[PDB]
């Protein structure tokens, strides 16, 4: 597959990686559960002037 031919000849060939593929996916975030105050950054009574 790395020599780009269906018939390899007699010898020793270095090889690019194809054998192993990932299967699982791991996600790990810090243990924080506080919902962010989007009810005060957005939907406030008055904003500041520009």
């Amino acid at each position: 597959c790395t020599l780009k031919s269906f018939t390899v000849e007699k010898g020793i060939y270095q090889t690019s990686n194809f054998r192993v593929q990932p299967t699982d996916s791991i996600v790990r975030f810090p243990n924080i559960t506080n919902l962010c105050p989007f009810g005060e950054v957005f939907n406030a009574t008055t904003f500041a002037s520009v």
């Binding site: 018939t7 990932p22 810090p30």
Partner: protein, 189 residues
């Protein structure tokens, strides 16, 4: 990212999350929940060689794993996640330890011949007789100790006239390249 994760101890600073290396890749990361310093190793193992005869000779190959020690081959290839046709090539009774890593799939003989497929560190391989791939120490040549004494000489009485053939390249093909037609033929833009 993508890789394998191993428990290690790189002694991160308290206000640190990942540790780089000299190639600016993530050498290690910190677990955000267990506060444990993990270690990232690349999944691929470039450094594998396939030793084969011709395709119209046999569908049999030997595998050379470079600069490894043969007991830790399945943890360097990650043979648990491979197809079984790979997993037969990670362990077996044909394991031969060389100075260039070690070789699985070719039996090692104590004889010495001139060699066809050079493997390295003096080890060569060939496809012999049913039929199988063998690996052996390469034979430098015929051992021949010459006699010597302080009052003995050797003088020829007959001769041979030999003709030897020597082939030398002199020239190669002359090529010329049109840039416009190669890069974009027939395009004004």
């Amino acid at each position: 990212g993508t890789g394998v994760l191993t428990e290690s101890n790189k002694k991160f600073l308290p206000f640190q999350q990942f540790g780089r290396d000299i190639a600016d890749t993530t050498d290690a990361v910190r677990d955000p929940q267990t506060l444990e310093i993990l270690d990232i190793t690349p999944c691929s193992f470039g450094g594998v060689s396939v030793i084969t005869p011709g395709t119209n000779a046999s569908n049999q190959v030997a595998v050379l794993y470079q600069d490894v020690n043969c007991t830790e081959v399945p943890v360097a290839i990650h043979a648990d996640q491979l197809t079984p046709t790979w997993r037969v090539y990670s362990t077996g009774s044909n394991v031969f330890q060389t100075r260039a890593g070690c070789l699985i799939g070719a039996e090692h003989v104590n004889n010495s011949y001139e060699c066809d497929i050079p493997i390295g560190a003096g080890i060569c391989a060939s496809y012999q007789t049913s039929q199988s791939i063998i690996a052996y120490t390469m034979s430098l040549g015929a051992e021949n100790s010459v006699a010597y004494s302080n009052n003995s000489i050797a003088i020829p009485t007959n001769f041979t006239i030999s003709v030897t053939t020597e082939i030398l390249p002199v020239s190669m093909t002359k090529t010329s390249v049109d840039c416009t037609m190669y890069i974009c033929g027939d395009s004004t833009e």
